[PDB]
Design a protein around this ligand. Structure first.
Ligand SMILES: Nc1ncnc2c1ncn2[C@@H]1O[C@H](COP(=O)(O)OP(=O)(O)OP(=O)(O)O)[C@@H](O)[C@H]1O
Ligand SMILES: Nc1ncnc2c1ncn2[C@@H]1O[C@H](COP(=O)(O)OP(=O)(O)OP(=O)(O)O)[C@@H](O)[C@H]1O
Ligand SMILES: [Ca+2]
Ligand SMILES: [Ca+2]
Lengths: 369, 339, 163, 398
């Protein structure tokens, strides 16, 4: 009846698009515009192709590339549908400029001439799949690890922090770490390779002292891995020390205190009537939330920063503090599914969605927000 | 006495089909394999790569023809056959942290894990989704082995807390009420009906009888302990000179067979008269090993006959060999073995 | 790379028809010839194993070379220039290889009148090659075959041979 | 401090040892060690260098196979005699810079570190990359204008010839390509050619004679037609004569050197001649190596093409190399400019003065700087932390 609704998440590095209602994404392609100079369709050929990213750290840099990216996202490769005869729902990042949000709908009403549009907050959509009103949505993709606090369907822009450490930075940390270990890899040639190795064997440990101990003393953390060239490398403690920059951002020469310290200093910096509520509902969504062992470390450090500062040494008064974080099994793309749910729910619900006629008559900023 | 060399690595879980026509197993991998039997040689037919880690538990609902599986992937998959492809459905376990078995009712499954909470789970047809309520009362450790009783309302499980408790995971929204059992009258979801008295050794094995009168379990203190509610929940233990047992199952109402780190399937009988357990002996008598499997047994299910009169015993171990046993051949071999 | 053969209106016979006194299906022949052209780059292409066909003339050059190999292999035991000429006539008179017969080691690469013209051109080409090579093969000293030409007796061009 | 450290590059066919700072090696010996066909000082009876090539009471063994070490103990004894018998310098009172292959394993570097630090108790130890010092030796052809650690280095030796891309001192393993034609294979080609062309040469001196032919008269030509037509038409000014002495009869044996002198050196420009399992020419290998690497550094890799090793000292090799490379490059550029509805790609093959032993020259030039005392792993750090201290060598000099 509504001419097929859809949902598209255009992230920094990985774009995930799926039909509304789908429990997963119906197409997941790498976000990179490629050009030739000689006489997942672009990622296959990158050694001899000039690749560019339209969405830099969440924001769009080159509209001439973003337009073609949209034409390739709605093209006969992944979606294969008419933009003028189908509605859509895009995902936006927290702390985004009003100019960006305006230009988005502007280009979605004029360039693509869509008949339907429905934007929503990624921090809100990520919790929407979990079915909650108040919670902490922390997104760590390839651009930046922004920590957003949501409450009653809204996010305090004065409470939304951000750590400049992303999956790309994890890759660079792993590739830098392996070099010291004795091996040798290139900064640009084996980029995706290093990213894969990190995605595979690397992780985040709970007890850094005990993990370092297990690595130095025992030979149980050391695992082997085969490369594309056929040669094999054996990485040990480098597996965990590389992702450990997520907890302490001083290991990569960055300004900040750490994701755990950021979340904790943003938790105690809330209303005292909401402090016991926001500490019991924290949603983990983003590519960097698939690192085996992040949940335990977050819970532990969050426990530390509310027992050294909130309890101030009081051991007995530590148990009373609620501590419950949920690492969902489908947390890898909660932003997408959360949309795929919303777009399925508000498919034909009243008329709370931007129209083309309302975008052609008047108001490119026709946004009830 | 029919051992089949399938792989070189160890085995995780052993499952069978309704008519025992197909067998399913996992080889400590991110995927689970399903093989059938076409003649003397066996050949693989299905492969499921849904889980994202080493598969720990897997059980197949016979009448329902539907196999559920849950392991290190911190998730559960209620796989059902869809045409020529086994489609898996992600049943949320809701656990922040190694066992699974369907009920006799084949309507809800128990998922005992390291979250110190026996996560029972039924299928809500109202929301077209699986829900998992967690029974965590009086539970201090992971659920090694979980086995149902004939009531399909009371579950038994051994823990790393050196005890084998028999609690109730009865969801009153998926079945009718439960009749009065000898193990108690008050049966509520989360209510602890029974427990062990051991303070040593881990309860790696646990299985209830067919009559539902007695519940036995194997502890890792080189000791096996069977309890009978027929004699006011009397507990009868016995220390084996052999190593610890890993899996425990009953062949008859008074005769059980079990193996483990001893790497050799053993038989035992418990006299209701005196009220004590007795050892039958070594049913598996013949690398360098003196037995079929070159490692410890890891699981032991029943092929056909029931827990009152098993005609064939299926044994999976850490040796990578499928040990198919028969009570008839075993009784024809060892003449000094009273079942 | 490898070597190739250097008219718009030129007759052809089969997959491959370009100055000798021997009779044949050969047209009148300029200063340089196909035999001379084949003899020019003979010592080079012999070591090469891989080769690509660019023109029909290249097949003829390959044939002349493959014939030159056996011709030299036979001339290796020569003791006189006249003996070499006679042996050249014997080689030209020989018929053991044909296009897609019992093995030309290149039957995958290459009517009655066409076959006759091809065979005649083959005998004429073999005779021309033998006769032309017979003079250059022997040195002015002691009427013996030169070692600098018998050097390529063991090497085989395109890893194939007529014999 | 007051004294000088020692430098030792172990190659497949020849080992180059000496003192850093010197113009040439203090001893350039053969990569072979004498052994018995065991307790006590049985390991002390070991001869290395040229004095082991033709032992009769002992057996001549080869250790360095294709740049990598095969038998560790033998190499240990060899380094022992290289330190005490050939160099005769106090190890505890001197540092040392050892050379590694392009495909040197990390564990191998660890083992080398163990053998150098535990047994010798060296005051300093530094394991360097061959191409890294090679680009530095190539930075001793061009003066101060363009001395950079960016460029593509092709190291050809007796064991294996390789094309390794180097960027700012850091090599790109994913782009590195291996070649099959090495100095021993060209020497062997000369041996077979000489075996088929003329006779009267003793079999016990055939190989050495072939090597001599590859040394004195071997030269690479531009065309394969003219170098033969000049020998067929003239052959009075081209064909050279070689005279040797048969070690057996002590008599003057003589042979004629000709076309082989062109063919052997031509084996690199065309590998199809003597290898059925190889069809790629060196030009294509270098092209693919430069192309399969980062695009941003591709121009720099094509700009600084450095020749390293002994097998690249042959006459007019780099000329033909640069010719073919620039030919294919200009061709592809024209093809890209014909369908363009491009800037001039500059390519240069550098020929260093010490291109024969560049791997050791670069090391001597690195060890002479003060930074080499700051960069080299200390014995203290080696005993305090472990072998992992020698696992990552810093690159400086830029
Ligand atoms: N198993 C894994 N463990 C840890 N990190 C991973 C894993 N898989 C992928 N990643 C990382 O996640 C990043 C991308 O995640 P994701 O697609 O969820 O965010 P994004 O949409 O690309 O970024 P943003 O939302 O900030 O624009 C990649 O850089 C990758 O390194
Ligand atoms: N004058 C010369 N001109 C050209 N090539 C020569 C000359 N003398 C020796 N060679 C060849 O160079 C080869 C040795 O080269 P080089 O010293 O670079 O290798 P290496 O360092 O001993 O071994 P690797 O390259 O594995 O380290 C020998 O096989 C020899 O055939
Ligand atoms: Ca995202
Ligand atoms: Ca070398």
């Amino acid at each position: 009846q509504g001419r097929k609704v859809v949902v598209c998440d255009n992230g920094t590095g990985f774009v995930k698009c799926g039909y509304a209602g789908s429990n997963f994404p119906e197409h997941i392609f790498p976000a990179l515009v490629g050009r030739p100079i000689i006489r997942d369709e672009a990622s296959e050929l990158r050694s001899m192709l000039e690749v560019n990213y339209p969405m830099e750290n969440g924001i769009v840099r080159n509209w001439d590339d973003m337009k073609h990216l949209w034409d390739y996202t709605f093209g006969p490769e992944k979606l294969n549908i008419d933009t003028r005869n189908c509605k859509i729902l895009l995902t936006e990042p927290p702390m985004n400029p009003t100019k960006n949000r305006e230009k988005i709908v502007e280009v979605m009403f004029e360039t693509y001439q869509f008949s339907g549009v429905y934007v929503a907050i990624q921090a809100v959509l990520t919790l929407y799949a979990q079915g909650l009103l108040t919670g902490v949505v922390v997104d760590s993709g390839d651009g930046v690890t922004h920590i957003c606090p949501v409450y009653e369907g809204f996010s305090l822009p004065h409470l939304t922090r951000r750590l400049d450490i992303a999956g790309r930075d994890i890759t660079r940390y792993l590739i830098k770490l392996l070099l010291l270990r004795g091996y040798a890899f290139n900064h640009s040639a084996d980029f995706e390779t290093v990213r894969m190795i990190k995605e595979k064997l690397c992780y985040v440990g709970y007890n850094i002292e005990q993990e370092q101990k297990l690595a130095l003393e025992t030979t149980v953390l050391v695992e082997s891995y085969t490369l594309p060239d056929g040669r094999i490398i054996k990485v040990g403690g480098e597996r965990f020390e590389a992702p450990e920059a997520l907890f302490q951002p001083h290991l990569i020469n960055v300004e900040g205190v750490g994701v755990a310290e950021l979340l904790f200093n943003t938790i105690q910096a809330a209303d005292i009537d909401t402090r016991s509520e926001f500490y019991k509902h924290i949603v983990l969504s983003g590519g960097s939330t698939m690192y085996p062992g992040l949940p335990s470390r977050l819970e532990r450090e969050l426990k530390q920063l509310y027992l050294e500062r909130v309890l101030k040494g009081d051991v007995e008064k530590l148990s009373k503090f609620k501590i419950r974080i949920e690492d969902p099994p489908r947390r890898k793309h909660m932003v997408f599914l959360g949309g795929a749910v919303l777009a399925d729910i508000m498919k034909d619900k009243d008329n709370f969605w931007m129209t083309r006629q309302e975008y052609q008559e008047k108001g490119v900023r026709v946004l009830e927000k | 006495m029919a051992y089949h060399s399938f792989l070189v690595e160890p085995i995780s879980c052993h499952a069978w089909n309704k008519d025992r026509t197909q067998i399913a197993i996992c080889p400590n991998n991110h995927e689970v394999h399903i093989y059938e039997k076409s003649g003397n040689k066996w050949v693989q037919v299905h492969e499921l790569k849904e889980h994202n880690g080493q598969v720990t538990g897997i059980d197949w609902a016979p009448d329902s023809n539907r196999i559920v599986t849950c392991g290190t992937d911190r998730n559960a998959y209620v796989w059902t056959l869809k045409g020529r492809t086994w489609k898996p459905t992600l049943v949320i376990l809701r656990i922040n942290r190694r066992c699974v078995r369907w009920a006799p009712n084949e309507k809800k499954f128990a998922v005992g894990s390291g979250s110190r909470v026996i996560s029972i789970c039924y299928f809500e047809q109202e929301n077209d989704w699986w829900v998992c309520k967690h029974i965590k009362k009086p539970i201090r450790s992971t659920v090694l082995s979980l086995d149902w009783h004939p009531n399909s309302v009371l579950l038994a499980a051994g823990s790393c807390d050196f005890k084998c408790r028999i609690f109730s995971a009865y969801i009153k929204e998926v079945e009718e009420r439960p009749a009065p059992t000898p193990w108690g009258s008050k049966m509520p979801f989360g209510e602890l009906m029974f427990e062990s008295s051991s303070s040593c050794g881990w309860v790696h094995g646990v299985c209830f009888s067919a009559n539902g009168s007695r519940v036995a379990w194997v502890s890792h203190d080189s000791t096996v302990c069977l309890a009978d509610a027929d004699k006011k929940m009397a507990v009868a233990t016995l220390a084996s000179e052999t190593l610890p047992l890993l899996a425990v199952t009953f062949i008859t109402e008074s005769s059980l067979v079990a193996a483990g780190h001893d790497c050799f399937p053993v038989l035992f009988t418990y006299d209701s008269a005196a009220g004590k357990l007795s050892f039958g002996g070594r049913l598996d008598v013949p690398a360098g090993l003196d037995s079929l499997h070159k490692n410890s047994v890891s699981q032991i299910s029943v092929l056909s006959g029931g827990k009152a009169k098993c005609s064939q015993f299926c044994t999976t171990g850490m040796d990578g060999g499928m040990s198919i046993w028969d009570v008839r051949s075993l009784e024809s071999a060892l003449k000094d073995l009273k079942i | 790379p490898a070597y190739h053969s250097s008219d718009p209106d030129t007759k052809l016979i089969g997959n491959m028809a370009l100055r000798s006194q021997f009779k044949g299906p050969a047209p009148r022949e300029k200063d340089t010839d196909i035999v001379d052209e084949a003899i020019y780059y003979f010592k080079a292409n012999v070591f090469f194993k891989n080769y690509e066909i660019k023109n029909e003339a290249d097949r003829t050059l390959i044939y002349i070379t493959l014939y030159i190999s056996e011709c030299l292999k036979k001339l290796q035991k020569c003791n006189s220039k006249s003996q070499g000429e006679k042996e050249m006539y014997t080689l030209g008179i020989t018929n053991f290889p044909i296009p897609g017969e019992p093995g030309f080691p290149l039957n995958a690469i290459y009517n009655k009148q066409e076959d006759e013209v091809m065979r005649a051109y083959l005998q004429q080409l073999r005779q021309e090659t033998g006769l032309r090579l017979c003079e250059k093969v022997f040195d002015p000293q002691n009427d013996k075959p030169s070692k600098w030409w018998t050097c390529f007796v063991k090497r085989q061009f395109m890893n194939k041979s007529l014999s | 401090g007051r004294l000088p450290a020692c430098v030792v590059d172990c190659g497949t066919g020849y080992t180059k040892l000496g003192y850093a700072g010197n113009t040439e090696p203090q001893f350039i010996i053969p990569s072979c060690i004498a052994i018995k066909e065991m307790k006590g000082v049985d390991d002390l009876d070991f001869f290395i260098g040229d004095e082991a090539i033709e032992k009769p009471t002992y057996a001549t063994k080869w250790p360095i196979r294709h740049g990598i070490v095969e038998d560790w103990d033998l190499m240990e004894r060899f380094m022992e005699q290289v330190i005490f018998k050939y160099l005769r310098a106090e190890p505890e009172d001197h540092y040392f810079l050892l050379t590694e292959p392009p495909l040197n394993t990390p564990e191998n570097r660890e083992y080398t570190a163990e053998i150098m630090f535990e047994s010798f108790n060296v005051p300093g130890l530094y394991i360097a990359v061959q191409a890294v010092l090679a680009l530095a030796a190539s930075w001793t052809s061009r003066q101060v204008g363009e001395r950079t650690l960016t460029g593509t280095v092709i190291d050809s030796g007796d064991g294996v010839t390789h094309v390794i891309p180097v960027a700012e001192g850091y090599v790109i393993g994913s782009c590195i390509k291996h070649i099959p034609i090495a100095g021993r294979d060209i020497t062997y080609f000369i041996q077979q050619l000489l075996r088929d062309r003329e006779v009267g040469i003793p079999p016990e001196q055939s190989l050495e004679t072939a090597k001599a032919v590859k040394e004195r008269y071997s030269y690479v030509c531009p065309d394969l037609v003219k170098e033969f037509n000049k020998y067929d038409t003239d052959g009075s000014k081209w064909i050279k004569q070689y005279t040797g002495i048969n070690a057996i009869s002590k008599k003057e044996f003589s042979i004629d050197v000709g076309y082989e002198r062109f063919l052997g050196p031509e084996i690199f420009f065309h590998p199809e001649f003597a290898n059925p399992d190889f069809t790629q020419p060196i030009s294509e290998v270098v092209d693919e190596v430069i192309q399969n690497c980062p695009i941003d550094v591709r121009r720099p890799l094509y700009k600084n093409i450095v020749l390293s090793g002994g097998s690249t000292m042959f006459r007019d090799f780099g000329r033909r190399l640069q010719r073919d490379l620039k030919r294919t490059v200009d061709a592809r550029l024209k093809l890209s400019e014909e369908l363009s509805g491009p800037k001039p790609i500059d390519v240069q093959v550098i020929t260093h003065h010490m291109q024969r032993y560049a791997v050791w020259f670069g090391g001597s030039m690195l060890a002479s700087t003060p930074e080499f005392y700051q960069v080299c792993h200390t014995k203290k750090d080696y005993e305090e932390i472990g072998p992992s201290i020698c696992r990552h060598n810093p690159v400086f000099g830029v």
